[PDB]
UniProtKB/Swiss-Prot annotation:
Organism this protein belongs to: Haemophilus influenzae (strain ATCC 51907 / DSM 11121 / KW20 / Rd)
Superkingdom assignment: Bacteria
Protein name: Uncharacterized protein HI_1552
Pfam entry (one): BioG
Family matches, as InterPro entries: BioG
Length: 214
């Protein structure tokens, strides 16, 4: 996978796992706590994370959408200070616990630049939110298409769960991707759940990283 590393000379690390095909810039507006570096992880063509986590004292994970499933594999066996899921579950292609199969598979079967934009409208909700999201630099179509191909294969072949344990989960009330009922069904007996009014992309409602876990 790809990374973007921010050296703020921190003792601690915030680890952000992006959604499938999403722009890393979608979290630039979040203020970091003092004494924290940031590592943005994305482009899940594979699960290789070429980065040394060892120097950090505390590592806090924030994973959005399909990033939750990815983070469970990448960080299995790594001690985390906290792990926060944002509109994502351990079973991302799942009629009960994730994105319904018809939607997940349908998205890949029909994926074009045009349907990509329609899917981003579904992720963002209203037109104004969608248009704001379009100002983030878009990742190349061929890259996000290959990413979904890779994710689809991996997710179909590996339905393991609870590879790490989560501290809390945020669930958007109008999420049209991971439906709120499915998110609640997954997280109910696993971790604290925080409901928030919003859409699958909900980072726009936050100003500070730390609000996500504190």
């Amino acid at each position: 996978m790809k990374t973007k590393f921010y050296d703020y000379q921190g003792e601690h690390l915030i680890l952000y796992f992006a959604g499938w095909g999403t722009p890393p810039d979608a979290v630039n507006h979040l203020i970091l706590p003092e004494n924290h570096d940031l590592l943005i992880c994305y482009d899940y063509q594979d699960l290789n994370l070429d980065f040394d986590l060892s120097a950090y004292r505390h590592i806090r994970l924030v994973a959005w959408s399909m990033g939750v499933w990815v983070a469970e594999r990448v960080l299995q066996g790594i001690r985390l200070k906290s792990a926060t899921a944002v509109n994502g579950t351990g079973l991302p292609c799942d009629d009960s616990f994730g994105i319904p199969y018809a939607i997940f598979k349908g998205t890949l079967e029909n994926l074009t630049e045009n349907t990509r934009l329609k899917f981003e409208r579904r992720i963002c909700g209203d037109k104004a939110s969608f248009e704001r999201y379009q100002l983030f630099p878009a990742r190349p179509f061929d890259e996000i298409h290959q990413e979904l191909t890779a994710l689809f294969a991996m997710i179909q072949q590996d339905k393991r769960i609870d590879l790490i344990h989560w501290a809390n989960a945020w669930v958007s009330s109008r999420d049209k991707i991971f439906t709120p009922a499915n998110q609640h069904q997954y997280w109910a007996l696993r971790c604290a759940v925080q409901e928030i009014e919003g859409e699958h992309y909900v980072f726009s409602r936050f100003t500070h990283w730390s609000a996500l876990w504190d």
